[PDB]
Amino acid sequence: GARTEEASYSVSGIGVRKNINTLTVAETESLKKALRAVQQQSGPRGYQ
Amino acid sequence: RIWAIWQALQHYRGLPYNSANCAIASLRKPLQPFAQTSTINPDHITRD
């Protein structure tokens, strides 16, 4: 299902919003850990 | 022509048409004996 049928390109957005099908395995866990490291912060940056 | 209309058929049905999926490792070796010096290969585009 998730295959884009033209997966030879794996460009990175940087502010760009892409669909879950275009989401790549290499950046998957990267985003996961990024949000993990962002959520628990405090202050104005604080997710809470 | 058969090859081309075949790829057209996969494109029409949505299947990727110009990407092999069983002999990827084998396809690493460039075509022979048509990758030699410019003396052997009079053409440049096939050489590259």
> Resolution (in Å) of the shown entry?
4.4
C-alpha distance across the termini of chain B, in Å: 24
For chain B, the maximum distance between any two Cα atoms, rounded to a whole number of angstroms, is: 44
| Structure letter (DSSP) for residue A34 | H
Whether B18 contacts chain A with CB within 8 A: no
Closest CA relative to residue B36, chosen from B28, B26, B27, B46:
B46
Is residue B18 within 8 A of residue B11, CB to CB? The reply is: no
Measured between CA atoms, how close is B8 to chain A, in angstroms? 15
Quick one: tokens of B11?
């494109």
Q: Which residue of A has its CA nearest to B11?
A: A5
Is residue B25 within 8 A of residue B37, CB to CB? The reply is: no
Measured between CA atoms, how close is A15 to chain B, in angstroms? 29
Closest CA relative to residue B27, chosen from B37, B38, B19:
B19
Is residue A42 within 8 A of residue A48, CB to CB? The reply is: yes
To which residue do tokens 């202050």 refer? A43
Length of chain B measured in residues: 48
Pure H helices in chain A: 25-39
Experimental method: cryo-EM
Interior/surface letters A14-27, b for 16+ CB within 10 angstroms, e for the rest: eeeeeeeebebeee
Note the Cα B21 to chain centre separation in Å.
Answer: 13
